[PDB]
Design a protein around this ligand. Sequence first.
Ligand code: G2Q
Ligand code: G2Q
Lengths: 251, 251
Amino acid sequence: IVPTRELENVFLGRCKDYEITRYLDILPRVRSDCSALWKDFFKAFSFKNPCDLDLGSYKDFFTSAQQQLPKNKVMFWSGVYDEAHDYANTGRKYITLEDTLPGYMLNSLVWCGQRANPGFNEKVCPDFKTCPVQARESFWGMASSSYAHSAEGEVTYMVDGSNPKVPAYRPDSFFGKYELPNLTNKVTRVKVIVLHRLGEKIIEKCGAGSLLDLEKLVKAKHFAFDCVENPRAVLFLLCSDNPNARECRLA
Amino acid sequence: IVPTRELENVFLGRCKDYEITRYLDILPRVRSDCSALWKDFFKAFSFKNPCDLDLGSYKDFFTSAQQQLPKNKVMFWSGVYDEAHDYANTGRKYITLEDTLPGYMLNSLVWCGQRANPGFNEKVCPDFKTCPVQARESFWGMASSSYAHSAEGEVTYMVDGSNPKVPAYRPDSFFGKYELPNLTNKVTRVKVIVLHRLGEKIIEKCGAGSLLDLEKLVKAKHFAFDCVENPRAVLFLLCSDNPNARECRLA
Ligand SMILES: Nc1nc(=O)c2ncn([C@@H]3O[C@H](COP(=O)(O)OP(=O)(O)OC[C@H]4OC[C@H](O)[C@@H]4O)[C@@H](O)[C@H]3O)c2[nH]1
Ligand SMILES: Nc1nc(=O)c2ncn([C@@H]3O[C@H](COP(=O)(O)OP(=O)(O)OC[C@H]4OC[C@H](O)[C@@H]4O)[C@@H](O)[C@H]3O)c2[nH]1
């Protein structure tokens, strides 16, 4: 795995771009400036073995970078990156982690520590299947935890109901590990959107299988629950990429 | 209008973000430094009255920032910003100006010259509706000229076929003034997509009115031509935002 070149300049430029021009009437600005956020992010991993991290490593960075999130708008997603982010629509309909400042800054980036100067590796990072899980998930797991902990009102969760190999809800996804269990009593309701991919066998349904497990967990955390499969607004987005599909037939 | 804050920092950050991380497998990198782009850009408007620009002003910036564009994937749009960009899909289906380095760096920014130090106005810029035509259009007009100049193969032009106040095709739009005249013999075909917004009345149709004007122009420059109104992939995208529209009735 190749680390991102010029990591600090990419971080600092995305940061400033965001601060001044991104999600302006959608998410609040952070108090800390871009240089103070870099200091917190860099110290989490710098000057240490690339596997020497834990879930507390970026704690100071996420405290500085966390934004209050708009009630009823927070979305989580598993196995449907593209469909969830198309539907959420750059913050216009829902917020995803990828719209928040830290999620926007680090999305797709690749970085790791080293002990020798300059304290990070610009040549290679290890396959993180090689590091303990708490190190491998130190950044995105704490991102998901801090994100979910800030959610208020109804939350939305979009899942894949057509994957034979991967249940729609599973406790070991980032959602199952970091998000569902970290929703606070300021959350009222979990609304599940199940994707039934076009022209494919339906593997999971509302009220059965892992959606029923998920329903039970939601009610045990004392929230309301509802679930829908291909609501129309979402079906039309699917149809846009596959217009000849049977499900998309008009009048 | 209020100008963008920290224009240099925004421009440089967006520049560096793009360079390293954006459109990597879709559009080539430019040879120039972010600092060398900023100098060409700033000198175009700095230390001048705000309305003192013409088509020529930004010439060096656009010569530096110009990327070779993927054959057949170049899209133009008039009056349908949001729908054209949703369908083009961040470069996956088509390229728009806003996906290229200069379009990305300046998209939605506001800036203007002044003559006293620091050479730009950080308080107020005129609605350039106060400036002469060639000064209003100095930047985006020269952007559109240079973009159109680099297209090869088929190009696609999406227009609004439902605006009673503005014809689908206009010789004085950016497309008629800056894009169409600059298509080279490397271009083989102009493919028009007419949008008919849902539950609104139909104003323009292929083969008639201003689209007929456009068809004759295109063929006289020796390009093939075709035209379609709400092709299904675009329709489904319109329906996803208004699923109750009668045009969206499912089988
Ligand atoms: N957005 C992102 N960019 C990256 O560069 C990255 N690298 C690792 N990850 C992690 O890999 C995960 C994708 O694995 P899935 O099976 O499709 O589904 P879940 O496992 O439930 O992830 C989705 C949840 O976390 C985010 C969001 O809030 C959502 O609810 C990323 O989420 C992220 O934590 C990343 N996530
Ligand atoms: N901020 C901003 N960013 C942009 O990327 C941009 N692109 C155009 N404009 C301005 O938005 C205004 C809207 O004018 P219209 O009737 O919707 O369409 P046309 O006049 O045909 O301009 C659109 C074509 O040129 C650009 C692109 O390649 C597209 O093909 C225009 O005065 C244009 O100068 C822009 N303004």
